[PDB]
Design an enzyme around this catalytic site. Structure first.
Site, PDB file in Angstrom:
ATOM      1  N   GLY A  19       7.466   1.272   7.638  1.00 37.42           N
ATOM      2  CA  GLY A  19       6.501   1.955   6.768  1.00 37.42           C
ATOM      3  C   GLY A  19       5.741   3.116   7.403  1.00 37.42           C
ATOM      4  O   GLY A  19       5.455   3.081   8.610  1.00 37.42           O
ATOM      5  N   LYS A  20       5.388   4.156   6.596  1.00 35.15           N
ATOM      6  CA  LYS A  20       4.639   5.328   7.080  1.00 35.15           C
ATOM      7  C   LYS A  20       3.263   4.889   7.551  1.00 35.15           C
ATOM      8  O   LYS A  20       2.449   4.501   6.706  1.00 35.15           O
ATOM      9  CB  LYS A  20       4.477   6.361   5.951  1.00 35.15           C
ATOM     10  CG  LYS A  20       5.716   7.187   5.665  1.00 35.15           C
ATOM     11  CD  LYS A  20       5.481   8.149   4.495  1.00 35.15           C
ATOM     12  CE  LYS A  20       6.657   9.063   4.273  1.00 35.15           C
ATOM     13  NZ  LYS A  20       6.529   9.822   3.003  1.00 35.15           N
ATOM     14  N   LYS A  35      -1.230   2.678   5.431  1.00 36.02           N
ATOM     15  CA  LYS A  35       0.202   2.461   5.248  1.00 36.02           C
ATOM     16  C   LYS A  35       0.552   2.878   3.846  1.00 36.02           C
ATOM     17  O   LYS A  35       0.088   2.253   2.889  1.00 36.02           O
ATOM     18  CB  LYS A  35       0.588   0.983   5.496  1.00 36.02           C
ATOM     19  CG  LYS A  35       2.083   0.649   5.458  1.00 36.02           C
ATOM     20  CD  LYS A  35       2.288  -0.874   5.569  1.00 36.02           C
ATOM     21  CE  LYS A  35       3.687  -1.306   5.915  1.00 36.02           C
ATOM     22  NZ  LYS A  35       3.958  -1.063   7.353  1.00 36.02           N
ATOM     23  N   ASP A 128       4.401 -15.437   9.581  1.00 37.86           N
ATOM     24  CA  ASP A 128       4.939 -14.448  10.505  1.00 37.86           C
ATOM     25  C   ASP A 128       3.996 -14.163  11.688  1.00 37.86           C
ATOM     26  O   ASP A 128       3.782 -12.987  12.039  1.00 37.86           O
ATOM     27  CB  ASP A 128       5.259 -13.155   9.729  1.00 37.86           C
ATOM     28  CG  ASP A 128       6.333 -12.251  10.315  1.00 37.86           C
ATOM     29  OD1 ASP A 128       6.984 -12.663  11.318  1.00 37.86           O
ATOM     30  OD2 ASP A 128       6.545 -11.135   9.755  1.00 37.86           O
TER      31      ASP A 128
HETATM   32  N1  LIG Z   1       1.440  -1.353   9.376  1.00 42.74           N
HETATM   33  C1  LIG Z   1       0.509  -1.413   8.714  1.00 42.74           C
HETATM   34  C2  LIG Z   1      -0.668  -1.528   7.870  1.00 42.74           C
HETATM   35  C3  LIG Z   1      -0.912  -2.708   7.173  1.00 42.74           C
HETATM   36  C4  LIG Z   1      -2.066  -2.709   6.374  1.00 42.74           C
HETATM   37  N2  LIG Z   1      -2.434  -3.812   5.657  1.00 42.74           N
HETATM   38  C5  LIG Z   1      -3.841  -4.088   5.345  1.00 42.74           C
HETATM   39  C6  LIG Z   1      -4.354  -5.316   6.088  1.00 42.74           C
HETATM   40  C7  LIG Z   1      -3.460  -6.506   5.747  1.00 42.74           C
HETATM   41  C8  LIG Z   1      -3.959  -7.755   6.437  1.00 42.74           C
HETATM   42  O1  LIG Z   1      -3.443  -8.164   7.457  1.00 42.74           O
HETATM   43  N3  LIG Z   1      -5.000  -8.451   5.867  1.00 42.74           N
HETATM   44  N4  LIG Z   1      -5.640  -7.999   4.739  1.00 42.74           N
HETATM   45  C9  LIG Z   1      -6.692  -8.700   4.601  1.00 42.74           C
HETATM   46  C10 LIG Z   1      -6.718  -9.942   5.380  1.00 42.74           C
HETATM   47  C11 LIG Z   1      -5.619  -9.674   6.430  1.00 42.74           C
HETATM   48  C12 LIG Z   1      -4.638 -10.810   6.586  1.00 42.74           C
HETATM   49  C13 LIG Z   1      -4.393 -11.329   7.851  1.00 42.74           C
HETATM   50  C14 LIG Z   1      -3.490 -12.357   7.989  1.00 42.74           C
HETATM   51  F1  LIG Z   1      -3.272 -12.847   9.223  1.00 42.74           F
HETATM   52  C15 LIG Z   1      -2.826 -12.935   6.937  1.00 42.74           C
HETATM   53  C16 LIG Z   1      -3.089 -12.398   5.702  1.00 42.74           C
HETATM   54  F2  LIG Z   1      -2.432 -12.908   4.631  1.00 42.74           F
HETATM   55  C17 LIG Z   1      -3.956 -11.344   5.496  1.00 42.74           C
HETATM   56  C18 LIG Z   1      -2.018  -6.197   6.157  1.00 42.74           C
HETATM   57  C19 LIG Z   1      -1.531  -4.946   5.430  1.00 42.74           C
HETATM   58  N5  LIG Z   1      -2.873  -1.642   6.266  1.00 42.74           N
HETATM   59  C20 LIG Z   1      -2.480  -0.559   6.944  1.00 42.74           C
HETATM   60  N6  LIG Z   1      -1.461  -0.441   7.804  1.00 42.74           N
END
Ligand SMILES: N#Cc1cc(N2CCC(C(=O)N3NCC[C@H]3c3cc(F)cc(F)c3)CC2)ncn1
Length: 273
Positions: A19-20, A35, A128
């Site tokens: 992903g970007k 992202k 994961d």
């Molecule tokens: N490359 C990249 C990338 C990803 C990204 N995201 C936003 C954060 C998201 C995120 O991890 N979470 N969101 C809220 C709780 C937390 C979370 C943690 C966890 F261990 C399990 C779960 F289910 C949720 C993952 C996707 N944003 C930008 N760039």
């Protein structure tokens, strides 16, 4: 609640290498990671479901868990915005030139346990957990991420579709290897933790970085685990016992994260800190 963000809220972006992933300078709320999961035609059919999912993931608020700061739901353009983590992932930090002392590593472990026990408490099963999903700040404090979108079904579908203009099995519990239908549990994550524990001390990826093959899969299913004797630096007796207990073939024999915390917090305070 979740912030509905505009591309106009950002000054500019620094795109990098699934992903970007662009570093983005927000006008008022500071530096952030973004992202762009999708770019292409309009898909008004899924906007309500994507917004519901981001609101759901935005409910996950903990000191050791990555915070979903906002979303960009624009016509033909979808993006997820999380907070900035300076030192990158856990593998990047361990494979660095500078050695990370036992006291820092022991704190990293305690923080992983805390973050995972919070997630499990909120009914979130990671599925994961791996060093690439453990992010580090400048002060060597960690946050658990879901960078591969394994816990976002709607947004994972966007990332992998036709209209869009854009992993490792070493940490996978053996009940999921050559069995894609079994529902993952809290104990599936406890297994992943055991291999993360190993990687923290070996300062490298397990199984000699041998491509995931049927020979390797069948061996892990049989009972093969990362080489404990491949750890050159000092690893206390208690941490080797912990990893050996957490990577047990029988899921019912593995501890829980609140269980691990109860034994690991006294050990870190008295012996590692
Ligand atoms: N490359 C990249 C990338 C990803 C990204 N995201 C936003 C954060 C998201 C995120 O991890 N979470 N969101 C809220 C709780 C937390 C979370 C943690 C966890 F261990 C399990 C779960 F289910 C949720 C993952 C996707 N944003 C930008 N760039």
């Amino acid at each position: 609640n979740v912030i509905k963000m505009k591309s106009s809220d950002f000054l500019e972006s620094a795109e990098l290498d699934f992903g970007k992933v662009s570093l983005a300078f927000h006008r008022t709320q500071g530096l952030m990671i973004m992202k762009t999961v999708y770019k292409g035609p309009n898909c008004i059919e899924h906007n309500e479901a994507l917004l519901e999912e981001a609101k759901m993931m935005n409910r996950l608020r903990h000191s050791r868990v990555v915070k979903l700061l906002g979303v960009i739901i624009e016509e033909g353009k979808y993006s997820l915005v999380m907070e900035y983590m300076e030192k990158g992932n856990l593998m990047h930090v361990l494979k660095a030139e500078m050695s990370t002392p036992l006291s820092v590593k022991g704190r990293i472990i305690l923080e992983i346990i805390e973050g995972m026990a919070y997630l499990h408490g909120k009914g979130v099963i990671h599925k994961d957990l791996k060093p690439e999903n453990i992010l580090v700040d400048n002060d060597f404090h960690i946050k658990i991420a879901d960078l591969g979108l394994a816990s976002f079904k709607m947004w994972s579908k966007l990332n992998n579709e036709e209209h869009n203009e854009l992993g490792t099995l070493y940490y996978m519990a053996p009940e999921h290897l050559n069995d894609v239908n079994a529902k993952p549990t809290e104990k599936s994550d406890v297994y992943s933790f055991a291999v993360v524990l190993w990687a923290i001390f070996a300062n490298k990826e397990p199984y000699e970085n041998a491509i995931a093959e049927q020979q390797l899969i069948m061996a892990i299913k049989s009972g093969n685990r990362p080489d404990v004797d491949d750890i050159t630096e000092y690893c206390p007796r208690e941490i080797i016992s912990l990893m050996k207990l957490c990577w047990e073939a029988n899921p019912e024999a593995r501890p829980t994260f609140p269980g691990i915390e109860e034994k690991f917090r006294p050990f870190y305070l008295s012996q590692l800190e």
